Amino acid sequence: KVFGRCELAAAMKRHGLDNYRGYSLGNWVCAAKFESNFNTQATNRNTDGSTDYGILQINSRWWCNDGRTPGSRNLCNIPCSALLSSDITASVNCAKKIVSDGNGMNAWVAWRNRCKGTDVQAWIRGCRL
């Protein structure tokens, strides 16, 4: 599923991301926009044997188990395929985990590179919430 920003905002907001650990909704939408272009099925298979899964391109080395990544910690305790669901819940939950595991949204390189220091409210602006 490729979300629209407002639909992803709404979903992320229903999932409590707004202000989750001080990161406004826009941050998360923006992260998703630049990690995955809101594509829940986004995968980036890396040369380091890890893969980035889902709308938030969560990486399989630490966060989810795709079985094929050296050094798997699966700290979100989910198969990585669960991050490729059309529903964002797993990704959200794992994203929350990532932040709860003492990583800011800097954990998302797309967030750091494309959202950090930007008008992330732009990503939820004009949305029904």
Curated annotation (Swiss-Prot):
One MF term in the entry's GO annotations: beta-N-acetylglucosaminidase activity
SUPFAM superfamilies in the cross-refs: Lysozyme-like (SSF53955)
EC number: 3.2.1.17
Localization per Swiss-Prot or TrEMBL: Secreted
Binding-site positions, substrate: D101
Family assignment from sequence similarity: Belongs to the glycosyl hydrolase 22 family.
Gene Ontology CC annotation, any one: endoplasmic reticulum
UniProt-listed Gene3D superfamilies: 1.10.530.10
Subunit (UniProt): Monomer.
Keyword Ion transport assigned: no
GO biological process per UniProt: cell wall macromolecule catabolic process; defense response to bacterium; defense response to Gram-negative bacterium; defense response to Gram-positive bacterium; killing of cells of another organism
Name the record gives this protein: Lysozyme C
Source organism of this protein record: Gallus gallus (Chicken)
Catalytic activities: Hydrolysis of (1->4)-beta-linkages between N-acetylmuramic acid and N-acetyl-D-glucosamine residues in a peptidoglycan and between N-acetyl-D-glucosamine residues in chitodextrins
Miscellaneous notes: Lysozyme C is capable of both hydrolysis and transglycosylation; it also shows a slight esterase activity. It acts rapidly on both peptide-substituted and unsubstituted peptidoglycan, and slowly on chitin oligosaccharides.
Encoding gene (name): LYZ
Domain C-type lysozyme: 1-129
